[PDB]
Design brief:
Length: 333
């Protein structure tokens, strides 16, 4: 019959206990500022929905980042804004400084407190064992926070992590795909980038939660420790699941299909095949063995699960042995 419902293991009802205004972003009223308070200096990047610039706030000569939004439905703009306002001041979350419109074109833009244009993809293939653990732990602070605040990011990838490596400092950015978690809500599966899409998205299971972000985290982690970019390298969304299947095995995949009574797209009938669950040692070689430990593999194994309910929560992840020396060094400092 229909697909079996799912609920988050943690932070399940947090939005329900909030005032409506917290999560009812469609009702949020934006007070739009004047973009002529800022002067654009140089282009930092391009996105699907946005042109990103370094700018100066004339009023105080502070450097900022201006994300000029390419046109899109007002609904999506309010969602990003409301989420950013709700998470402001949270650990390792990018800080929204201002919301503005160009007076002539009327194009909306978000102004963020300045952080370096060096995304994580630019150096996550060259880090030491300790630094991978350090920066992973820092990303986990952001995810545990946003999840505790009733929000899933849905676009966790190296490009959305800004690192100031000189200052051992990190910001989770681009909340334009993030959404509020509500028990029983069915969500859009066209989210995240191919290589970081969780199996729920790939088999069209809509009642997903915070655990989505933990799959993506696992994908990042595997890429870093095995020096393999990306770890799951699909040609498209169908072949993406096949890539996962060749590592995680088809047995746990079908058990997962059956548990949630998922109707599998028939394009998958021919291509998934039958594969054993592979031991992680298979991806260890001379150029990456220094980043790989029993702790790292145990942790990774507990992130990369078909069944979203089986994956570690961000808090559970932060308590894994992999981070013991990070936690000890943090208390010291
Ligand atoms: Br580059 C960059 C920076 Br810096 C920030 Br902050 C962004 N926020 N959304 N998209 C962003 C991009 Br692309
Ligand atoms: Cl990326």
């Amino acid at each position: 019959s229909g697909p079996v419902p799912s609920r988050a293991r943690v932070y399940t009802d947090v939005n329900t206990h909030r005032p409506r205004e917290y999560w009812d972003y469609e009702s949020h009223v934006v007070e739009w500022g004047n973009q002529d308070d800022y002067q654009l200096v140089r282009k930092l990047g391009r996105g699907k929905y946005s042109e990103v610039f370094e700018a100066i706030n004339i009023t105080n000569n502070e450097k900022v980042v201006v994300k000029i939004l390419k046109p899109v439905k007002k609904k999506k703009i309010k969602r990003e804004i409301k989420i950013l306002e709700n998470l402001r001041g949270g650990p390792n979350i990018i800080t929204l400084a201002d919301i503005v419109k160009d007076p002539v074109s009327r194009t909306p833009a978000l102004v963020f407190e300045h952080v370096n244009n060096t995304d994580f993809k630019q150096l996550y293939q060259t880090l030491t064992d300790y630094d991978i653990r350090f920066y992973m732990y820092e990303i986990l602070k952001a995810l545990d926070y946003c999840h505790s605040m009733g929000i899933m990011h849905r676009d966790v990838k190296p490009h959305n992590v800004m690192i100031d490596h000189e200052h051992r400092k990190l910001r989770l950015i681009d909340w334009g795909l993030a959404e509020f978690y509500h028990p029983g809500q069915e969500y859009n599966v066209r989210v995240a980038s191919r290589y970081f899409k969780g199996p729920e998205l790939l088999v069209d299971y809509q009642m997903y939660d915070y655990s989505l972000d933990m799959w993506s985290l696992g994908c990042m982690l595997a890429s870093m420790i095995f020096r393999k970019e990306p770890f799951f390298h699909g040609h498209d969304n169908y072949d993406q699941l096949v890539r996962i299947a060749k590592v995680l095995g088809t047995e746990d995949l079908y058990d997962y299909i059956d548990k949630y009574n998922i109707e599998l797209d028939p394009r998958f009938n021919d291509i998934l095949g039958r594969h054993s669950r592979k031991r992680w040692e298979r991806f260890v070689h001379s150029e990456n063995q220094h980043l790989v430990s029993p702790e790292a593999l145990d942790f990774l194994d507990k992130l990369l699960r078909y069944d979203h309910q089986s994956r570690l929560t961000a808090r559970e992840a932060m308590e894994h042995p992999y981070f013991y020396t990070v936690v000890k060094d943090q208390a010291r400092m």
